[PDB]
RNA sequence: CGUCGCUACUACCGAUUGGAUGGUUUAGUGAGGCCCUCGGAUCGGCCCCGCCGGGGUGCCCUGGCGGAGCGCUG
RNA sequence: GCGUUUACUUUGAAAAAAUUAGAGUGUUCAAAGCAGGCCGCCUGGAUACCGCAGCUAGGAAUAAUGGAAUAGGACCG
RNA sequence: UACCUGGUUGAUCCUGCCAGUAGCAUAUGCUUGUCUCAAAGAUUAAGCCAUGCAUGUCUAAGUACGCACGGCCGGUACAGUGAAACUGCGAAUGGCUCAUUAAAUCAGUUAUGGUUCCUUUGGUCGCUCGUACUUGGAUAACUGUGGUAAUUCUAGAGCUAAUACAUGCCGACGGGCGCUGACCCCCUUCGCGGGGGGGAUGCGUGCAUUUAUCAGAUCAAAACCAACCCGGUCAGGCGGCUUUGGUGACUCUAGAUAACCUCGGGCCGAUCGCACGCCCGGCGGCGACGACCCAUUCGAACGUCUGCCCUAUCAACUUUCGAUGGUAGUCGCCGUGCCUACCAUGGUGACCACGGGUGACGGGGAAUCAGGGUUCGAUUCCGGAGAGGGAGCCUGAGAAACGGCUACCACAUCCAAGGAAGGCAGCAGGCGCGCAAAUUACCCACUCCCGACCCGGGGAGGUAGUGACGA
């Protein structure tokens, strides 16, 4: 080719959107932004297929143009704006502040929070760039460059930033004994404690994650997102809290579900 | 012995011209647990492609082989072996792949048929894309 | 693009050749010089009209401009008039008044945070000298082993 | 234009790479600069990514550093003597790198006559016909004379520069290329290269 | 089982430098574009000469006008 | 943060979707499709599989290859 | 479902073939009442093409004296609409086909510590030091005469705007640092002293960019003569002290000194619109924008490892025509024979090099199948190649682009015979070649894309018509 691509085919779209086959040919291109392509979720789906607040593509255009949605502190009007991991979608007209957390299966489900809680978010740091004639910066995983960080906070740590000032409050150093959120691979949406890390110079390191139910699996470190110290997490969680029931246990939760309700 | 060339050979990083009352020698490590040889620091050889005293890093893969030809200058030829596997017939077959490897002069006791361990780097020439990290001896025969 | 042109020397140049007059005419020829056709419009620009119509630094251009009475078919003619080119400063003050105060704000933001980082190291320096004077004071106790 | 591809030539073993595309624009090569020593003339050239490279067709002046006492100086150029690639890039003057230049550079008397408390040359017994170097040397003070006393006893130039402040030598050969960077900044050398180069200016002899 | 004898069939060798087509390919010329060296049509313009205005302190700049080094330079 | 090896075997990461194999659903059934079911409510949109090589991690039967015999022998001072 | 039957002989047991049998996908014949899905000029000719279409754009916010039109409170210049010019924005995506290409393309795999990246998100925006109450001059639309058989052909005169084209202030402001050192103070000895303390003056004072240098960012160790700033002062008498982060690995991000900085120029707002009050000329909030550099995003580009069809009636090849290496350079976004200049004579191969064919585009996959495997993958998804054939280049972040230009060869149009213009392997539709394959219809509503942007466009796409490929 000669320039960059712009369109997107329905089949080549990522799996965790759960788009059907018939309705069309193209899938909406995620705009250039902070998050990766295969790691985000557009507002036009979140407001047309997941929440179903509107049906047609022009009426999505007739929503965010009325200065309603204030993402993490500042209103964007791009109807296909890429919103990814750790974003506080805030609707002013009904107040239903949303947080986008991974389900127990490999997808993004709708998780509501309270407006009291919609004040901060937890960000994973990526690097420390020392700006000479001066001070070090930071680069988190959503590309939030910050000045004057700390002489303590290091490469793979997590911090608790604020919305309207873009400033830190607290932080957690990565030690074996914190929580863990597996962001990517065959364990996309699991939570457990950390028990071991292995060094592979030149190569990439790996980390064993123990589920609360004994199930000890493994995961390379670039999918790790520490959220809490000890056993205690710091935010609310979706329902399940990272069960990952077996495939035959879904028989039980699907059978005695109705039978225990009606 | 040294400087048989039309230009002047030197390491570029050091200033050798202050009020002189031997020059300090440049050398670095490599990582991955490889010791520098004794002959490098003490040695007066100079090169811009040696992985100890030049502007080249060491990255990627690490291989092995065996030395078989030394007629060229500052490069030697090794011979890798492996075994392909047909699954139709439940057997193997032999192959051999060869390559041209840049040789630092810090290694001296290298005869023919010596097990070597190479390392990937930036492309140095048309076909040399590897450096020699260590050279062993074959099955005895010291005499 | 390639085109086809003609030379710059008039040899056989039939087809009209446009005859401009850049010299004074002294006598009366009928078709040309009967009526001084005026300019279709006049100026706009502001230093060009300030200085052009008999005016100094400290006077006012809000009236010295071409009015152009029209003929409509059911109304009175109206003075169509322009407003361009850096009129002196009615409220363009207001944007410079803000531009020179955000420079006071970004300087305030780089003045509040420098000394604050100086205090945050000011805290961790009592420890930066404490840890050397505590651990090496215990290390001589370990060496006396 | 001229290419820098790999496909237009053979493999390692004598075969022929048959071509599978035409010449792409990112495989560009320009004609050479081949600069001279004249007036100042520099062309700007747009490059990949919207950036700019600066050529230099005709060049006169430089910026040469003395790597011992931490000084450098904008400096005039006249001559070309020894090139390490071509015997003919002296006969036709061209300024590229590791070409020793000997570039009269103001013959160490626009530079060396900057507050060094000494004369040199002037076949001995000879003086300066104006009295203006003797002014700098006959002005006394209290403790700044001691200041020149210390910046006088730890300072002796070598003999090879002691004999050569007539025309102005350089082992320099500006380490930046002028056809790509614009300007021309080199560096005077001392010791054990002056022997190698002047040995290459012993065997020249046509 | 074979020779000869009538009909029918496919390739083969072969004449005339038997023959031509099309594709891969050497030595001599070689439109056209791109860097270079100059070229200077041109529009100039200020200054450099000369006039009145005015303000200024006979001259200095400010607005029309007579002329010139091809002066400076884009 | 090394423990001087390959070959072989087991584990662990990593592996584009669709397709295929496969649960769920009563388009009036079916091939398809991913929806829909109760008086504002409740969900779903799973899993498995994925050779040949390279990286990790343990295994030492089999199959190759090594030391001291012109002793320049391997420790210990 | 790991399966068989007829046929040599006067009759029998055999090796062995022939014909049956069932799936599959192209054509064709005969017959054809109904209903849901649904292939379609790829196989010969990547051979040629009339007509009609297939890419443009404005918001409360750059410039509207477009009456083509139309506010009335005018008398201090502008209501909202609203062709053209520019500025930006795109036109480099999307579509269509498979002629080339056999370690090349590709899939998996790893590198950028060897480099560039419009826009988005976030940074930064006095750091650099000595007419501005916004400067200056031209060119569209328009008016007004035209030439030209003909074209999206264009001149001449007059106007006139800019987030275009170019100039160049004010500022915070006092200062310190490094140097040159007018000169300045003090002790002592008679001093020629070594012991000390003050300081005008001139330069200069980031970042980007180029050169050179310094240490850092070192680990456990001692016995002593010339020095003398601190503390023992007991009488020469014996102990000492100050410090950026990483990476497997830096000639990395760093800090400081001497200067260097292109007239075909480097940064420092000489921008507009909504509210909008505050104070004696003075003060906030919001935005649209625009540039420098650091991150980030979509990526792109060069390379690593391993992995392919037939042929020995192709067994030796390459190399002063760069073949394989060493040195210094040139170019280029960077690494290299990519290319010049100088030296050496080497590199692959029966473990199938080299050369030739292919009715070869590759991979995801499809049909039959016990297990093994054979054959097909032109064709809706990813990745590359190409627009009759071959070479060349502009603008631009990005193209050797062809619904963009410059020439050759082949094919080809209108002409007043002076000249002009072109490219369906884009959707439809004809000619042709064939055993061989559909409507010159309707519409932006769906899915989505472009722009200055809620609002205009899209033969991409969708819905219908033909349709016994088939289910
Ligand atoms: Mg492209
Ligand atoms: Mg097999
Ligand atoms: Mg894949
Ligand atoms: Mg054995
Ligand atoms: Mg029979
Ligand atoms: Mg029927
Ligand atoms: Mg068909
Ligand atoms: Mg294009
Ligand atoms: Mg083909
Ligand atoms: Mg081909
Ligand atoms: Mg072919
Ligand atoms: Mg392909
Ligand atoms: Mg079988
Ligand atoms: Mg078969
Ligand atoms: Mg593609
Ligand atoms: Mg071209
Ligand atoms: Mg091209
Ligand atoms: Mg076209
Ligand atoms: Mg054509
Ligand atoms: Mg085609
Ligand atoms: Mg549109
Ligand atoms: Mg289309
Ligand atoms: Mg039908």
Label this structure with key terms.
part of a larger assembly; 4 chains; A: 262 residues; mainly beta; 5-stranded antiparallel sheet; 3 helices; 17 strands; globular; C: 145 residues; mainly alpha; 0% strand; elongated; binds magnesium ion; RNA-binding; ribosome; Inhibitor 80S Termination Complex Blasticidin S Translation NMD; S4; 40S ribosomal protein S11
Can you tell me about this structure?
The structure is cut from a larger assembly and holds chains A (262 residues), B (143 residues), C (145 residues) and D (206 residues). Chain A is mostly beta strands. Chain A contains three helices and 17 strands. In chain A, the strands form six sheets. Chain A has a five-stranded antiparallel sheet, with no helix packed on it. Chain A has a three-stranded antiparallel sheet with strand order 5-6-7, with no helix packed on it. A three-stranded antiparallel sheet of chain A has the order 14-15-16, with no helix packed on it. Chain A is globular. Chain B is mainly β and 143 residues long. With 145 residues, chain C is mostly helical. Chain C is elongated and about 125 Å long. The N and C termini of chain C lie far apart (93 Å). Chains in contact: A-C, B-D. The interface between B and D is medium-sized, with 12 and 13 residues. The site of one magnesium ion has 2 residues of chain B, from loops. The structure holds three RNA strands. Chain B: Keywords: Acetylation, Citrullination, Cytoplasm, Lipoprotein, Methylation, Nucleus, Palmitate, Phosphoprotein, Ribonucleoprotein, Ribosomal protein, RNA-binding, rRNA-binding. Chain B: Component of the small ribosomal subunit. Part of the small subunit (SSU) processome, composed of more than 70 proteins and the RNA chaperone small nucleolar RNA (snoRNA) U3. Chain B: One of its GO terms (biological process) is translation.
Number of domains of chain D: 3
Q: Biggest sheet of chain D, strands in spatial order?
A: 8-7-11
Major sheet of chain A: size, sense and barrel closure?
5 strands, antiparallel
Strand order of the largest sheet of chain A: 10-9-8-11-12
Q: Tell me, briefly, the overall form of chain A.
A: globular
Gyration radius over CA of chain A? 20 Å
Estimated structural class of chain A? mainly beta
User: What is the number of helices of chain A?
Assistant: 3
- Helix and strand string of chain D, N-terminal first? EEEEEEEEEHEHHHEH
- What's the number of helices of chain D? 5
Helix content of chain A: under 10%
* Fraction in beta strands of chain A: 15-25%
- Beta percentage of chain D is 15-25%
Number of strands of chain A: 17
Binding site for Mg(2+) 1 (chain C): 78
Biased composition (Basic and acidic residues) (chain C): 125-137
GO molecular function (chain C): structural constituent of ribosome
Protein name (chain C): 40S ribosomal protein S6
